[PDB]
mmCIF file of C-alpha atoms in Angstrom:
data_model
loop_
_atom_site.group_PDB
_atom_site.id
_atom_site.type_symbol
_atom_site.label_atom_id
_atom_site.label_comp_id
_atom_site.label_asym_id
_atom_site.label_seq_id
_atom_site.Cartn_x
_atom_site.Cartn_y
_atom_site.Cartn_z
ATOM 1 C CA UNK A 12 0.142 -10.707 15.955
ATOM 2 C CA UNK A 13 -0.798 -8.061 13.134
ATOM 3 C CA UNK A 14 1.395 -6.644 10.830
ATOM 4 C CA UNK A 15 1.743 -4.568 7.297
ATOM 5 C CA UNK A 16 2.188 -6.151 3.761
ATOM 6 C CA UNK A 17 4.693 -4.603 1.126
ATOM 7 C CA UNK A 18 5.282 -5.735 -2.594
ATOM 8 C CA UNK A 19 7.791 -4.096 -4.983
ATOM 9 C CA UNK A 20 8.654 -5.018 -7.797
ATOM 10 C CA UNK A 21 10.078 -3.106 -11.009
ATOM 11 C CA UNK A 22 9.526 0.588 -10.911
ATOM 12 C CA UNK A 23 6.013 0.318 -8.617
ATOM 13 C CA UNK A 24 5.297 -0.654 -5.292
ATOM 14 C CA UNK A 25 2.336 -1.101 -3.237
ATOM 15 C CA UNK A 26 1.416 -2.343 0.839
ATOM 16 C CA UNK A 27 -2.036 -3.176 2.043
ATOM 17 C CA UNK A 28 -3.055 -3.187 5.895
ATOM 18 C CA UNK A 29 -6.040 -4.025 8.261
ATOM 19 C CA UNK B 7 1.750 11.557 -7.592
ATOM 20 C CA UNK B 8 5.712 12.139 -6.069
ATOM 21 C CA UNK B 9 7.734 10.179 -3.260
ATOM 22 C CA UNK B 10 5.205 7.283 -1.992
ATOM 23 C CA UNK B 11 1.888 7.768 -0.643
ATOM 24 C CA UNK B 12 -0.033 5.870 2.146
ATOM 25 C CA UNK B 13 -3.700 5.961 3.774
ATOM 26 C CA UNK B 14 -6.020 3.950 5.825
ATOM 27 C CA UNK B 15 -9.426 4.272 4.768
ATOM 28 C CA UNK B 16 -13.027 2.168 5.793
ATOM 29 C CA UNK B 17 -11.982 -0.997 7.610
ATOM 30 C CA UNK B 18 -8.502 -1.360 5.974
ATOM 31 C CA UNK B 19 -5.393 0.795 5.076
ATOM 32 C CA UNK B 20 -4.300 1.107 1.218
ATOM 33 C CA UNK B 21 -1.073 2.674 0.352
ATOM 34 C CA UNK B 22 0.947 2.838 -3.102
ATOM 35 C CA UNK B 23 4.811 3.730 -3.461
ATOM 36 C CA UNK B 24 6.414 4.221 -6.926
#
């Protein structure tokens, strides 16, 4: 199935989807 | 810019928190 991405790390986060 | 921020542009979505 599809989904979302999510990366944090640190002060800064970002998430990428299709 | 302030609290997070998330858009879908062209064929895939980009968004950025911080």
């Amino acid at each position: 199935r599809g989904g979302g991405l999510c990366y944090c790390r640190r002060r800064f986060c970002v998430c990428v989807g299709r």
